Each structure stands twice: as C-alpha cells, then as structure tokens.
C-alpha cells in the first residue's frame, strides 16, 4: 500500500540540505517533530514537509537535518518503509551525506535518551536551530521532546528560528509528478463544481427551504460515494503520472465547500458557507477545492439568477480581469505586488465603481499547502518572484455591491487553478465560467 518514492525523497531532502543554511536567520540545523496525527489541521508545516519528503505523514516521528546528514527518529514499523531506500542513498552519498534511522520505542527512557543525543548534535552544529515554530501536535512523544528542547534553550544558548519563508520558497516549484497530481486534483474540483451547480439550480427552481450551509454540506458528502469516485478514473487516470492510476483513496476535500447566496457575503480567507436561507436571485457564490495525493486545487464560480444589467456587466468585467491576470500579469519574475497592482490598474481603468469592493489579494501560491501565506498575491509582498513550475490559486472577488436601481445586494467571485509551465500559464480547472452557462432564469 505505502511505497515511498526514494528518488523524489533524495532530491527533495538534498534540496532542503542545500538551501536551509541561507534561510533567514542562518540556521545551523533543522528539527521537525510530528506528534499524533491531527486530521483537523492538515496544513501544518511539519505535516507538509512529510508529505513533500515522503508522500505520507509519519506520526510520532522526528526529522533533523544537518550539512552532513539527517536523523529520523521513528518506530520500527515505519523504519521498514525507509530502511532499504536509506541504505541505498547512504551508499551513494557515503562521503557527503548520511541518514541515520534511530528506532523509537514505547519503553520509557528510550526516546528521551535519543532526544538528548540529538540535542548534542544540534548544539554542535550551532546555536541557531530552524524550527516550525507555529506547529502544534499532541501525544507523549512530542511532549517528551518539548521538555528536552525547552531546557536545551535554557542549558545552552539556542535560538529557535522560524523557517516558514524558507520552506515556502523550497516547496514552490512543482516537479513533473506534482504538476500531474495538481491536474488530477483540479479536474476533481471541476467535477464537484459541476455537481454543485446542478444541485443549486434544482434547489432554486424548486423553491425549497434550505440554507447555504445545508446545500454545501450536501455537495461535501458526495465525495464519500466511492462508487461515484471510481467512475471518474477514465477522466483522471490519464492525468496521473506515467505508470500511475487514479486511486480513490487519495482524493479528499481541501476545505469544506462554500456557498453564499446573499444578501450578505464574505470573501475573507476565513469565510465559510452562510447560515441563511438560499436566496434564489441575483448572484450566488460557490467555491470548492480538492486534494489529490495531498496536492490542493481551487475553483470558485458565480451563478446568476435573473441578474440585473449591472450584475451581468460586472460579471463580464470580472472575466476580463481574470484573463488580464492569468494571461498578462502572471509572468516569471513578477512579484505578488506587480500582479495585484496590475489587477488594481485594470479595475481603475474600466470599472472604478468596483475598486473599493475588490478583494485585497488575488489569491496565493498553492500546492501541498492550500494557501501559502508567504506568497499571497497582494500589494504588500514585493519579495517573492513567480517561477516556472509554480501553481497558483487565482481567486478574485468584489463585495458590498448593490444594484443602483433595485438596491439588491450582490457580490462576485471567480477562482481557477493556474500552473506555470514552460509554455506559459495553463488553467487546470476547466469547468465553464461563460456567462451564458452560469446564468439561470425563472
């Protein structure tokens, strides 16, 4: 079932070795500690790191990285997935880089001594230690580790250094395999947006009493229909890497689907489905995002029900704005600020009535992390640069609009997953956004 891709493990672990000493703060070593799995917080940096290095989260596991090697503290059973590939890697890198697998144990005192041993190696490396400072896990293993670490900061003079920006830069560019998983994920997002539209239109047509949150929950639970998922394989298996087939067990939601039908809408990052009655008029916002083998995608659409002329005109503009971002501003070397400011320019030119209501960002880098907060497409970030192989959630919205004649409240939102390739940006989510196909009349 579980097979670690060891050429991928080697390349990514060595990339991390090569890059971490020049992370901000100049860490001399890295320590990442995964305690018990927390399925409620899948995007913690240490979990992302496991998914990146190994393809899987390894609970109750410590990984420390140095110039000359790597220490993994993990159970005998998990060591079985690693020992052959590590021995092969060690033989090749015999005079450069040595991975040591220290087998943990439930026997009291055993892991404690390993942690003490590891602290000796860390302090020998240097006083600056790179850590995922915001991560939180439970369990005996990490709790014993924290006691050792806290003292080593008190016994020796160690300063923990957060490495979020460094990891974000290291993870940004997607290799061939990752780009395939992102396309599978994105086609999954397409399928669920299609299901969402069909359910929405039916609920509106049938005037049923239902809240936005109940409707999005209905869609959300569709992913557990395994036999429905199996039938997606002809669309999805050709998008998987060479030698791989679609596996239903690796498809999940990136977040709970969001429906907001008004009159109040929320485009903030924290926003969820509204709790109020489905309003079958004007603008209805929908968002869903899928993970395939932990790679996130995102799609957002606006559906129009008997829209006013101002709604259709502004939806037409929203399409043109997304096109300007995707096919003009998303360029290798561009900063988030240049991209966001280019969007602001386009709105000021064509639709200044929409300047105030525009979202203060147009999305983010996306991948194993659904939203990379180190690479948000806003005016503030002038210190990241788009690279070939980056994948973006290009998501834009306008809130707090009213029709000038009826006073009807509305909002607009459109999002797509976009991959930078050598041939340029490639939109991975292909569910329709043509106004004629997202507009319904009753």
Closest by CA position to 378, among listed 392, 360, 400, 393: 360
| Beta-carbon contacts of residue 212 (< 8 Å; ≥ 6 apart) | 259, 260, 261, 273, 274, 275, 276, 277, 278
The experimental technique behind this entry is X-ray
349, 415: one domain:
yes
- C-alpha separations of 368 from 77, 198, 243 in Å: 25, 29, 22
Q: Based on the fold, state whether residues 176 and 134 are members of the same structural domain.
A: no
Helices (H), 281-410: 309-324, 336-350
DSSP assignment of 200-251 equals HHHHHHTT---BHHHHHHHHHHGGG-HHHHHTTHHHHGGGSPTT----GGGE
Instruction: Say how far apart CA 66 and CA 47 lie, in whole Å.
Output: 19
- Please, what sign has the CA dihedral across residues 136, 155, 64, 52? positive
Report the greatest alpha carbon distance in the chain.
76
Strand residues in 75-136 grouped as ranges (E): 98-103, 128-131
Say if residue 41 is in the same domain as residue 184: no
Q: Which residues does residue 394 pair with via DSSP β-bridges, in sequence order?
A: 363, 416
Check if the beta carbon of residue 403 is closer than 8 Å to that of residue 188: no
**CA geometry: angle at 42 spanning 39 and 44, to 5°?**
130
Q: Same domain, yes or no, for 270 and 392?
A: yes
CB contact at 8 A, 101 and 89: no
Ranges of H-type helices in 330-411: 336-350
Look up tokens 């292909």; give the residue.
430
Residue pair 57/50 in contact (Cβ under 8 Å)? The answer is yes
Place of tokens 């900061």: 153
Instruction: Indicate which CATH number applies to the domain containing 135.
Output: 3.40.350.10
Taking CA atoms, 34 is separated from 5, 49, 349, 431, in Å, by: 20, 10, 50, 37
Pair 112, 149: CB distance under 8 Å: no
- β-strands 376-378, 361-365 pairing: antiparallel
Residues in the chain after which the chain is broken, C→N over 2.5 Å: none
**CB-based burial of residue 86 (10 Å sphere; 0-12 exposed, 13-18 middle, 19+ buried)?**
buried
110 plus 206 within the same structural domain: no
Q: What resolution in angstrom units was achieved for this structure?
A: 1.7
**Among candidate residues 184, 141, 137, 161, the one with its CA nearest the CA of residue 42:** 137
Q: What angle do CA 39, 244, 386 make, to 5 degrees?
A: 70
Nearest to 330 by CA among 215, 416, 209: 416
Answer with the one of 154, 171, 188 that is the final residue of a domain: 171
* 429 and 285 together in one domain: yes
* C-alpha closest to that of 46 among 113, 157, 132, 161: 132
CA nearest 412: which of 338, 355, 357? 357
Across 400-433, b (16+ Cβ under 10 Å) vs e yields ebeeeeeebbbbbbbbbbbbbeeeebebbbebeb
**Residue (of 401, 435, 399) closest to 320 by Cα position:** 435
DSSP SS3 for 416:
strand
Are residues 199 and 160 part of one domain? no
Query: Nearest-CA neighbor of 195 among 220, 231, 224?
Result: 220
Residue 178: both structure tokens together: 């990752």
What is the tally of helices (H) and strands (E) in the chain? 13, 18
Same domain, 221 and 151: no
**Last residue within a domain, chosen from 171, 190, 205:** 171
The answer to whether residues 301 and 348 belong to one domain is yes
Query: 186 and 231 share a domain?
Result: yes
**149 plus 213 within the same structural domain:** no
Q: Which residue, of 171, 189, 222, is where some domain finishes?
A: 171
- Helix or strand run (H / E) with residue 33: strand 29-34
Which two structure tokens, joined as six digits, stand for 362? Answer: 């147009």
Q: 433: domain range? A: 172-442
233 and 167 share one domain = no
Distance (Å) of CA 1 to CA 192, 224, 364: 27, 20, 33
CATH of the domain at 392: 3.90.230.10
The CA distance from 77 to 434, in Å, is: 52
Please confirm whether the linkage preceding 437 is cis (ω < 30° from 0): no
Number of compact structural domains in the chain: 2
């Amino acid at each position: 079932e579980v097979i670690i891709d060891f050429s991928t493990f080697e390349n990514r672990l060595l990339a991390l070795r090569d890059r971490f000493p020049s992370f901000d703060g100049s860490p001399s070593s890295l320590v990442f500690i995964l305690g018990s799995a927390d399925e409620e917080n899948p995007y913690q940096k240490t979990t992302i790191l496991h998914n990146w290095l190994l393809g899987y989260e390894f609970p109750t596991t410590l990984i420390a990285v140095f110039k000359e090697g790597c220490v993994v503290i993990t159970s005998a059973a998990k060591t079985r997935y690693l020992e052959e590939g590590v021995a092969q890697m060690n033989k090749k890198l015999e005079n450069t880089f040595k991975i040591e697998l220290w087998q943990s144990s439930k026997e009291p005192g055993h892991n404690l001594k390993l942690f003490e041993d590891l602290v000796e190696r860390v302090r020998e490396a240097g006083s600056a230690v790179g850590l995922a400072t915001k991560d939180s896990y439970q369990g005996k293993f990490i709790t014993e580790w924290k006691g050792v670490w806290d003292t080593a900061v008190e016994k020796h003079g160690l300063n923990g250094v957060d490495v979020s920006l460094g990891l974000s830069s290291l993870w940004a560019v997607k290799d061939e395999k990752e780009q395939a998983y992102l396309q599978v994920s994105s086609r999954g997002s397409d399928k669920f947006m299609n299901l969402l539209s069909d359910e929405l239109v039916r609920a509106v047509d049938e005037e049923i009493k239902i809240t936005d949150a109940k409707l999005s929950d209905n869609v959300e639970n569709e992913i557990d229909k395994s036999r429905f998922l199996k039938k997606l394989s002809p669309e999805l298996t050709p998008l998987c890497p060479k030698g791989e087939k679609f596996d239903v067990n690796y498809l999940d939601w990136a977040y709970s689907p969001i429906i907001q039908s008004g009159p109040k809408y929320d485009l903030r990052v924290s926003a969820r489905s509204s709790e109020t009655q489905l309003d079958g008029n004007g603008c209805i916002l929908a968002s869903c995002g899928i993970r395939y083998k932990n790679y996130c995608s995102n799609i957002s659409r606006t559906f129009l029900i008997d829209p006013s002329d101002e709604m259709t005109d502004n939806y037409d503009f929203l399409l043109l704005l997304q096109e300007e971002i995707i096919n003009n501003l998303l360029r290798v070397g561009a900063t988030p600020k240049q991209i966001y400011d280019g969007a602001v320019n386009y709105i000021n030119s064509k639709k200044p009535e929409l300047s105030a209501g525009f979202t203060k960002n147009v999305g983010s880098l996306m991948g194993l992390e659904f939203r990379d907060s180190q690479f948000v497409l806003n005016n503030k970030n002038d210190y990241r640069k788009v690279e070939n192989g980056d994948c973006f959630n290009i998501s834009l919205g306008f809130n707090n609009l009213k029709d000038s004649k009826t006073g009807a409240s509305y909002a607009l939102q459109l999002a797509d997953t976009v991959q930078l390739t050598s041939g340029g940006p490639k939109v991975l989510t292909n569910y329709t956004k043509s106004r004629s196909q997202i507009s319904f009349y009753f």
